Each structure stands twice: as structure tokens, then as C-alpha cells.
Amino acid sequence: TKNKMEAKIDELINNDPVWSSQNESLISKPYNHILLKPGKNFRLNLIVQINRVMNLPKDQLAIVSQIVELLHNSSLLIDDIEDNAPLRRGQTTSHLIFGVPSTINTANYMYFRAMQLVSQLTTKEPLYHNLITIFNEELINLHRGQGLDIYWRDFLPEIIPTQEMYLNMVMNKTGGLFRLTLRLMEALSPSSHHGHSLVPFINLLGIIYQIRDDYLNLKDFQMSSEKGFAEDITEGKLSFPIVHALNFTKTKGQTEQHNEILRILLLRTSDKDIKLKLIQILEFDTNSLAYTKNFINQLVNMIKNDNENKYLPDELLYIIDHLSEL
Amino acid sequence: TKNKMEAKIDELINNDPVWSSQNESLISKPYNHILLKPGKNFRLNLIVQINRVMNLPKDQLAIVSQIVELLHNSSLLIDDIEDNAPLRRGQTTSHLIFGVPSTINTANYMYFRAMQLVSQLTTKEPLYHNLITIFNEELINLHRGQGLDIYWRDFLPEIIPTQEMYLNMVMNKTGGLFRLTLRLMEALSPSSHHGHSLVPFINLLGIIYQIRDDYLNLKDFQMSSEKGFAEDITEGKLSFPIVHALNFTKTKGQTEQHNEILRILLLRTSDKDIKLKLIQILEFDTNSLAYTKNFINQLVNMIKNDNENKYLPDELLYIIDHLSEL
Ligand SMILES: [Mg+2]
Ligand SMILES: [Mg+2]
């Protein structure tokens, strides 16, 4: 009917868009799948410990936590598509089960659900503005560092990053979410003057976290063809040890080794022997693994020897030792 | 050195993350590539026309425009990855030149750059909160609609949507950015009482826009194997004409035709002959193209005959006829 048609259309356009709980569940599949991954208690533990200094009431702390989890999980769903990763914590990656399209859309949807939860942290307009700014700033930083990490890898050998370039990329990429969490808590703290800001400390933790992630991905494989897959090699990633090896070989004039490192990265290979060959070049030829192990210990020592509490404000050590499960 | 190392690390963590204009350019490549696509003046046209009623000052209108262009472009970069599209406005899609990883990251980065421009629309804390809420809500709506469109396509034949389901998906998917633009403008209007909200009107524009897009994707191919490629068929899309046909064949018990349409969609084919074959079922068996043409005219009529200005508040007609270049 021309009349019934028009009446139904009129009703449609005069109401909010219709969305059912059934709809909500269908599009949530990729997210529900990655929730089966653990490590959630470790992240919560770091938030709970920082809260000994910030004192956010429990209800508010739970919301900060929900925001953090959504952003962290969304980042991993996108990152696995970006890295072409087959597994995440021993399980099949969501994009391989539900497809790349649904996974990208669900991860992006969850970023906006996280943004929505921010307005539940306060009713004070000045504070709210500040919270959304922190959220906006650090997601911008995360995307900038992720953008460089990806560009270096996909356009190699166009740019061979230096250690400093790598470190600035990580301050953006990994620091983004650490700082996002910490800044929200500091903005919300009802506590008078809980001492100097912990941003430097959280930046340091983000850097130790990333470099250790890079280091263990190779070391675990070197120690066992089944402890890890050294998937970072398959991905062609300009990891901390690889950056050291590429610059070391350049510097010492090891032309053949420089080029062979690049060649293997460019193969995107899953061959275990070829991955082990590159790892042993880093072990014996460039000593990049030892150099990295020592760099990490030095970073950790800047905290463990922080007597004048210039970074620190106990549980510290445990968190640092389990930094890999964040 | 252990001393200098620590010193360089302390400096790094006590500063904001380092990001250069050169870094900014690398990450912007996938985005600058789509900027070579036209239609921007048409979208600006619609904003300019609507501004006759809203009267936002030129500077503020320019920022709304920038926000609109970033969201529109980002959503197109992501959509082409989600639909595996080889071309966008006669040109090679960005993910095919810069890779899916850089394109996803850059598109997401730009959503956040747009979010940042929102805080430059006003300094009034109450209005600002409302602007962010508009931004947040409509982007959530765009992702819900997109998630469902993708779900139906990727899970076909699990769910065959009805016309109403399709129309609710469109209110979310397409209406999201039309409403986002209009709501921002209505929230910012200094103008006293610029008449009833134009949201119902913009909703209708979005529906007409989407159904015409689905319609032309097939009609252009039916009229020329080089005017268009009917990529929607290759994508397996549950487009308006396809939804009508699947339900028309179910309804009349034409079991073989119902199944043949599904088989073609499920092929994900680029074979012109097979695509023409689907088009002829829609033209001769279900008459879905005429039905759709007629449905569109009826929608348009609702505006063309809106004498009591229930939806309208001249350039209306031109806008309606060039709705496809938005
Ligand atoms: Mg990764
Ligand atoms: Mg599309």
C-alpha cells in the first residue's frame, strides 16, 4: 500500500534506530572469543596496586578497569589482524574464526563502548572533559606508534630504525595504554597530594614490557621449538634485538649478515630452521640477545635501585617479574 | 655505559612521546590516497545548505566539515577492506597499495583525529559534553549497522533478512553519519528555534541514499558491463534488491530460484556471465529492480510532496537527485 508504506517509514524515521540484544550478541562474537584469554587478573592487579596510591572508590576503579579491558582486548583483535597472527595465548585468533571484516568492526565498536564508559566515571564537567582528553590523547599515541611499527615492517628495507627511533615508537605504541590507565587514575584521585606523578614510572614499565616481549619471543624459541614459535620473525617485525642486529652489522661492516637478516625477515617464513638460523646469528654474530638481556636488566635496575623514590611512589618486584602476563 | 644509558632513558620517560612531522606523513599515506577521490564538494554542499537553517559561524562550520570528512573517509578505507573492494571511485583502494595493516591503522587513527576536533567546536563544558555524546552515540550506531550488514553477508545462508530488518540495519549504518553531522549542527546552532529537528529528514535521506546505492550497483551493470561491475554481487551483499528477491522467492514458493540466488551470492564470483544471470532472475522472475526503483520514488515523494513541511524545514531537489555522489 502507498499509505501503509509511508506510515511505516514515518514511524521508522521518527524513532531511534532499532537494535536488539540478539543483534548485540551476533556482532559480539569476535570479542567474546578473545575474553576466553587469561591475564585479566594480572592487569587488574597492577590497577589495584596503583590504587593504593590513588584511592579511587571501588565502584569507580571497576569502571576504569572495564575501560582498560575493552581497549586492551580491542587492540589485540586489531593487532593480530595487522600481524597476520594465527594464535593469541595458545588459542586461534578471532579473525581466522569470524573473518577479518567482523573482527575489525567489532574491535572498533568496542573502542567506542569504552569511550562511552568514560562518562560514567564522573558527573563533573570539568573533570569529564579532562578524562576524555586523556583517552583521546593516548589512543592517538597508540595509533601513531602502531603505525610506525607496521610501516617499518611492511616497507622494509625502506627504513632501518635505530634504537632511539624504536624507543620513541614504543613510548607511543606500548606506553599509550599504560599512560592511559595511569593518567585516568591520577585525574580521578580524590587523594590530596599522592606524591609526584607516576607517568615516568609507567613509561619505564611500558618500555621494559615491550622489550621483554620482543626478547622472550626469540629466547623461548631458542630454548624450545615448542615453548614458542618465534612468530615475530614470521611477522618481519623490527623488534628490539633485530634493530640492534641490523645496526650492529651495519656499523661493523658485516655486509652479508646485514643482508641475510633482511632477507629472512622478508621471507615471512614459518620454517623452524630458518628462524633458528636468524636467532643464532643474533646469538653468536651480533650478540643481540645478550645485549638485549642486559638492556632489560638495566631498565629494571632503574626501579629496583630507586631508593630516593624518584620513580617509585614490595609488590613492585612481583609485578615487574610478571610484567609479561599483562 | 651504564650511566649514560640510564640518563638517556630518564630523559625519554620524563618527556611526552617523540613524534615528528615526518612520522605523521608516513602514517597518513593511506589517508592522503583516498583524498584524491571526489564528491567532497557535494558533501560540503549539503552541510552548507543545512547551514542556512542552523547558521553556525563559518569557522565553526569548517571544523564540522573537517570532522565529517575524516569520518567519511576513514569509514570508506575500512569498508573497502571489509568488502574486499578493488576500486573506490575508479581508483585502486588504499589497502591494495599500502597493505591492510597500515590502512586499518590509519583509518582508526583518523577516527581519533576527528574526535579531537570535536573539542575545538566549543569551550562551553556543557555543550562539549553533548557534542562528544553525539559523536559517541552515532559512531556506535554506524558500527552496529555495519556489523549486522557484514554478519548477514558472511554468515549467509544462516539469516535471510526481511525488508524491515534491512531498513533497521540501514538506520544504524547509513543514518549514523548523516545524523551525526546534523545533530552536531543542531546542537551548535546559535539560532533561536530553527523549527522542528531535521533528524527525521536526514534519516530519510540516509535510507534513500543507501537503497539508491544498492540499486545503481546492479542497474549500472544491467545497462553496461563497463558503467559498473555490480561488485555487490561479488561481495555477497544482502542489498535491498537482493533482500526483496530472496523474500519474494520464499513467499511464492519458487524454491529453485530462491536457492539459485543464494548459490550465486555464495560463489563470491567476478564472472560477468554469472552476475548477469542473477540480474536476470531479479529482472524477470522477481522484478526486484522495478520494485526497488518504485520504492525509492515513493521515499523521495514523501519529501517532494511535503507541503505542510513536516519533514522539510529548492536546493532540496538538486540535493535529492545528486544524493549518489555524497
Ligand atoms: Mg602483535
Ligand atoms: Mg561497501
Side-chain angles (χ1 to χ4, degrees), chain B residues 131-255:
Chain B
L131 302 176
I132 280 299
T133 292
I134 284 158
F135 180 90
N136 203 341
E137 288 182 346
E138 295 305 349
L139 273 165
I140 279 165
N141 290 339
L142 164 71
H143 290 263
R144 282 180 175 169
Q146 176 82 167
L148 199 54
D149 200 23
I150 286 165
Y151 186 102
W152 291 337
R153 181 194 77 204
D154 287 356
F155 274 84
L156 192 76
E158 192 203 7
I159 298 170
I160 286 179
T162 70
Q163 183 171 94
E164 172 175 353
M165 290 165 69
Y166 170 93
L167 286 172
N168 291 325
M169 176 278 291
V170 166
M171 276 284 291
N172 280 289
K173 185 183 78 179
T174 311
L177 290 190
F178 280 88
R179 276 191 308 273
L180 163 28
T181 304
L182 182 69
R183 293 175 62 194
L184 283 184
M185 286 181 85
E186 287 188 347
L188 290 169
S189 186
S191 301
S192 64
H193 331 311
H194 39 254
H196 61 246
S197 178
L198 301 178
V199 167
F201 173 73
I202 223 76
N203 276 161
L204 193 46
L205 217 48
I207 292 167
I208 287 164
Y209 168 93
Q210 191 59 59
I211 299 179
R212 179 177 287 179
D213 182 50
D214 292 356
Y215 174 73
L216 291 174
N217 193 256
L218 300 183
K219 201 62 181 187
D220 289 346
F221 184 76
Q222 179 181 46
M223 291 172 68
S224 166
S225 66
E226 291 219 46
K227 271 192 58 179
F229 303 80
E231 264 297 308
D232 286 357
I233 290 173
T234 301
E235 173 193 329
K237 196 154 170 165
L238 281 294
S239 72
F240 189 90
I242 289 298
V243 169
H244 174 267
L246 287 172
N247 294 289
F248 178 98
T249 47
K250 162 154 58 263
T251 288
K252 303 236 151 291
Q254 312 189 323
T255 302

Side-chain angles (χ1 to χ4, degrees), chain A residues 17-293:
Chain A
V18 168
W19 188 245
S20 61
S21 63
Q22 297 56 45
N23 287 332
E24 183 70 12
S25 308
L26 294 185
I27 71 168
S28 301
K29 282 174 189 308
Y31 195 75
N32 292 340
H33 175 263
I34 202 185
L35 284 176
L36 304 189
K37 307 227 162 57
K40 189 168 311 159
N41 292 302
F42 279 87
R43 277 187 300 289
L44 173 71
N45 177 65
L46 182 54
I47 300 183
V48 162
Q49 290 303 323
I50 286 169
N51 204 215
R52 288 152 79 49
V53 166
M54 310 300 164
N55 302 301
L56 311 203
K58 288 178 173 174
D59 301 347
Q60 210 179 225
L61 190 71
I63 294 169
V64 166
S65 203
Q66 288 167 51
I67 294 168
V68 151
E69 286 303 303
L70 278 161
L71 293 178
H72 180 62
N73 289 328
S74 284
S75 289
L76 306 184
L77 291 171
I78 289 305
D79 184 77
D80 288 335
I81 290 161
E82 285 169 348
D83 296 349
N84 203 228
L87 300 170
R88 172 64 60 183
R89 303 285 201 203
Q91 198 51 247
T92 305
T93 284
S94 297
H95 59 93
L96 287 181
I97 299 174
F98 309 101
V100 165
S102 268
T103 302
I104 288 168
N105 190 77
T106 297
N108 283 171
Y109 175 43
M110 295 309 179
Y111 283 147
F112 295 99
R113 288 295 244 188
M115 185 193 286
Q116 197 169 52
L117 292 178
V118 171
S119 85
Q120 277 178 50
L121 290 166
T122 327
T123 54
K124 298 159 67 270
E125 292 294 18
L127 176 54
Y128 175 72
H129 186 268
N130 294 357
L131 306 187
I132 277 293
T133 288
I134 287 157
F135 179 98
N136 207 340
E137 279 174 3
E138 298 304 348
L139 289 183
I140 271 162
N141 296 338
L142 168 56
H143 289 267
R144 288 179 169 165
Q146 178 81 352
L148 284 182
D149 205 23
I150 285 168
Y151 191 90
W152 296 339
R153 177 198 76 200
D154 289 1
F155 290 95
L156 190 78
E158 183 186 308
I159 293 165
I160 304 295
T162 55
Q163 183 177 96
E164 163 165 50
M165 290 175 258
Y166 168 95
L167 291 173
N168 292 327
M169 172 275 298
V170 176
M171 272 293 282
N172 281 280
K173 185 179 62 167
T174 320
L177 287 193
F178 278 73
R179 285 191 302 276
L180 189 45
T181 303
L182 183 52
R183 296 175 67 203
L184 285 181
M185 293 173 73
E186 300 199 334
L188 294 158
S189 180
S191 168
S192 326
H193 184 295
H194 45 271
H196 65 245
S197 171
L198 310 182
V199 170
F201 173 71
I202 223 65
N203 279 160
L204 186 64
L205 222 55
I207 295 172
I208 288 166
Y209 170 86
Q210 190 60 63
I211 295 179
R212 192 180 277 171
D213 172 17
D214 289 4
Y215 178 74
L216 293 178
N217 190 257
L218 304 182
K219 202 69 189 179
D220 293 352
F221 190 79
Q222 181 185 54
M223 289 184 75
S224 225
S225 287
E226 260 46 71
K227 265 173 69 181
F229 325 72
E231 187 60 30
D232 282 1
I233 290 177
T234 298
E235 299 169 358
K237 193 171 182 166
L238 280 299
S239 71
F240 190 91
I242 284 294
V243 170
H244 174 273
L246 285 166
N247 284 285
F248 178 94
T249 55
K250 171 55 82 216
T251 292
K252 300 284 177 305
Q254 298 189 179
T255 306
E256 184 81 3
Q257 298 92 140
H258 183 91
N259 291 166
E260 177 63 356
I261 290 165
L262 293 174
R263 189 187 69 90
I264 297 175
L265 291 165
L266 289 171
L267 286 176
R268 297 314 188 239
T269 185
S270 285
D271 186 289
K272 71 188 284 282
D273 293 293
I274 294 180
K275 290 196 286 202
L276 188 46
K277 175 185 179 176
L278 174 62
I279 289 170
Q280 303 297 252
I281 282 170
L282 304 200
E283 177 63 43
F284 305 112
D285 183 270
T286 68
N287 319 301
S288 296
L289 298 187
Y291 176 93
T292 298
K293 183 187 166 191

